[PDB]
Amino acid sequence: MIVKNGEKWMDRYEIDSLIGKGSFGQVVKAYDRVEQEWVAIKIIKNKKAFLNQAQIEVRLLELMNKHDTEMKYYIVHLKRHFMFRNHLCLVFEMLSYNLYDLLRNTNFRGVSLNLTRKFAQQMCTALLFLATPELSIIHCDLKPENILLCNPKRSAIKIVDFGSSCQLGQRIYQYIQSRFYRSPEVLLGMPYDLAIDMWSLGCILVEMHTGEPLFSGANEVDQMNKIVEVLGIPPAHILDQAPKARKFFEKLPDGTWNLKKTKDYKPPGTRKLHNILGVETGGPGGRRAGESGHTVADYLKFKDLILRMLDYDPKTRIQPYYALQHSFFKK
Numbered sequence: 001m002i003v004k005n006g007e008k009w010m011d012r013y014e015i016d017s018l019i020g021k022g023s024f025g026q027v028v029k030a031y032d033r034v035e036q037e038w039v040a041i042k043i044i045k046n047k048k049a050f051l052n053q054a055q056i057e058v059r060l061l062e063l064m065n066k067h068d069t070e071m072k073y074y075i076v077h078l079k080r081h082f083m084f085r086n087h088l089c090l091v092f093e094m095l096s097y098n099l100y101d102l103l104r105n106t107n108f109r110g111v112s113l114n115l116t117r118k119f120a121q122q123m124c125t126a127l128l129f130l131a132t133p134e135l136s137i138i139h140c141d142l143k144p145e146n147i148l149l150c151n152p153k154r155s156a157i158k159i160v161d162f163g164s165s166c167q168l169g170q171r172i173y174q175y176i177q178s179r180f181y182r183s184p185e186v187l188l189g190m191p192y193d194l195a196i197d198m199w200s201l202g203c204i205l206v207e208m209h210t211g212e213p214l215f216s217g218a219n220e221v222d223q224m225n226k227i228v229e230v231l232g233i234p235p236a237h238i239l240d241q242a243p244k245a246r247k248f249f250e251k252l253p254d255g256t257w258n259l260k261k262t263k264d265y266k267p268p269g270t271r272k273l274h275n276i277l278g279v280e281t282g283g284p285g286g287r288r289a290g291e292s293g294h295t296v297a298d299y300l301k302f303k304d305l306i307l308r309m310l311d312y313d314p315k316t317r318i319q320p321y322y323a324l325q326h327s328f329f330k331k
């Protein structure tokens, strides 16, 4: 769809410029003459598939809107929606650039442990809000690109894009999440719950501090191999229940599991998170050596929280309320 700059919609919105494009369609900056403010309009393609996920996005955002609590404000605000020229249009507040752009701006050397902590605390609070029983929303696509600064000067963030989201027990797709941030339970073809967002969050926080993705698989096999390098072979009780366990692993005479090997990865559980983070070696690539708020003690707390977020078992993986009580967040 051609949207010219200066185009006026419905005597209300003046289109200014393109913010960006997705598989869903496009996001434009526009002036709202009624509220007298700038907004972001997400313009959904005139195709059944994209209309259908945007309709789910509108339903889930309107559901959140009716829960007035202290914890709903880490989610982008949907102001309203309308149908225009057979495109579903979602009107949001304007936010700023995304956390991937923040990383690119550091030349992928990563932000400080102190700024990582502020992001972690806001995202844990968002996930606690989505876990509200009457919401039980799984985001399903958390990644740096889907987390926006509220203001280019400041460290407030909001989660965007509920285009892949579902409520608990309303699963549609088996293949979900962006590969780098995809949970073991999704890789293993298992029924998934809100814990897949916490897995993504653990991956995101390590990446925000080191500048690089924790697990950058080129495909699902490579993804599971990179996770295993750091965390070891997933537990037997999980692999025993996993429809796609034999995509990656093999059950052994005595019902233990091992990697299926391909042509020539560090051996299982030997690419240690403590070395990735540089806990005892001045942080990622030693670049934090002697900066304040980057002591071994601060690093150990961060590492402890991440390993609770990257529990293989979605039953025992840390949950948002308990993540917020972790020592990493204690003054």
Ligand SMILES: Cc1nc(OCc2ccsc2)c2c(-c3ccnc(N)c3)c[nH]c2n1
Residues within 6 Å of the ligand: 019, 020, 021, 022, 026, 027, 040, 042, 076, 092, 093, 094, 095, 096, 097, 148, 160, 161, 162
């Ligand atoms: C500046 C800005 N950008 C945004 O999205 C950037 C983007 C994303 C994909 S393509 C370009 C947004 C959004 C936004 C974008 C996409 N989905 C939702 N639910 C909200 C709201 N407010 C914004 N302000």
Ligand SMILES: [Cl-]
Residues within 6 Å of the ligand: 140, 141, 164, 175, 176, 177, 178
């Ligand atoms: Cl997805």
